[PDB]
Structures are given as structure tokens and as C-alpha cells.
């Protein structure tokens, strides 16, 4: 004797020892990315190629 068994209810595990099918379908995909940058360029110049006479002391 197996006890009350339903007639229209789906066949589910109910007690200890009942078997159940597991469809293993795992798909995990995690990602991360990052970046940082900095730049700085400078040029300076001053040339008195021909100095006038009133400014040759400076």
C-alpha cells in the first residue's frame, strides 16, 4: 500500500525518497573593465634674434 495518490495532479515528489529530474542549465557571465589617463604638455620660448640698441642692456 502506497497511500492516497492523486489522479489529475502532476507527478511531483512529496515524501522522502521520491525522485525528481533536474535540468542543469547554468550560464553565468560577469565582466568589468575600467581605465584612466592624464596628459600635460608645455613649451615656452623667447628669442631676441636681433636686439635693438636701446634694449641691449635688458
Amino acid at each position: 500500500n502506497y497511500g492516497y495518490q492523486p489522479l489529475f495532479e502532476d507527478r511531483r515528489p512529496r515524501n522522502i525518497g521520491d525522485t525528481l529530474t533536474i535540468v542543469l542549465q547554468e550560464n553565468v557571465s560577469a565582466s568589468k573593465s575600467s581605465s584612466a589617463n592624464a596628459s600635460r604638455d608645455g613649451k615656452t620660448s623667447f628669442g631676441f634674434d636681433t636686439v635693438p640698441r636701446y634694449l641691449q642692456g635688458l
Binding site: 492523486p6 489529475f8 495532479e9
Partner: protein, 54 residues
């Protein structure tokens, strides 16, 4: 019977209750269920509770 027909007692009042359900046994005069997804969704919920998983 005048005082009862004219007044009400403090704390003696009626509240309002609301709920959602399904009506079955109609002669083809129910929802189309293609434009009312909640009818089929709640029917499937009831079946899943009762032991049928569609």
C-alpha cells in the same frame, strides 16, 4: 423607531471589502483571454496551487 432611523451609534459602522476572483461555468460567455492576460494567468496560478503546472 425614530432615533434609530435618524442617528447612528459611534463605533457601529460598516467597512468595505474587495477581492479578485474567477467565475466558472459560463455558457461560452466568459473572457476572450487573449485581450485579458490576467484571466489565464490567475487560472494557471490556481492550477499550480492545486497541483497542475501548465
Amino acid at each position: 423607531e425614530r432615533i434609530r432611523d435618524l442617528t447612528s451609534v459611534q463605533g457601529v459602522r460598516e467597512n468595505s471589502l474587495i477581492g479578485y476572483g474567477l467565475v466558472v461555468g459560463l455558457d461560452g460567455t466568459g473572457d476572450q483571454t487573449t485581450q485579458t492576460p490576467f484571466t489565464t494567468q490567475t487560472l494557471n496560478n490556481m492550477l499550480s496551487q492545486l497541483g497542475i503546472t501548465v
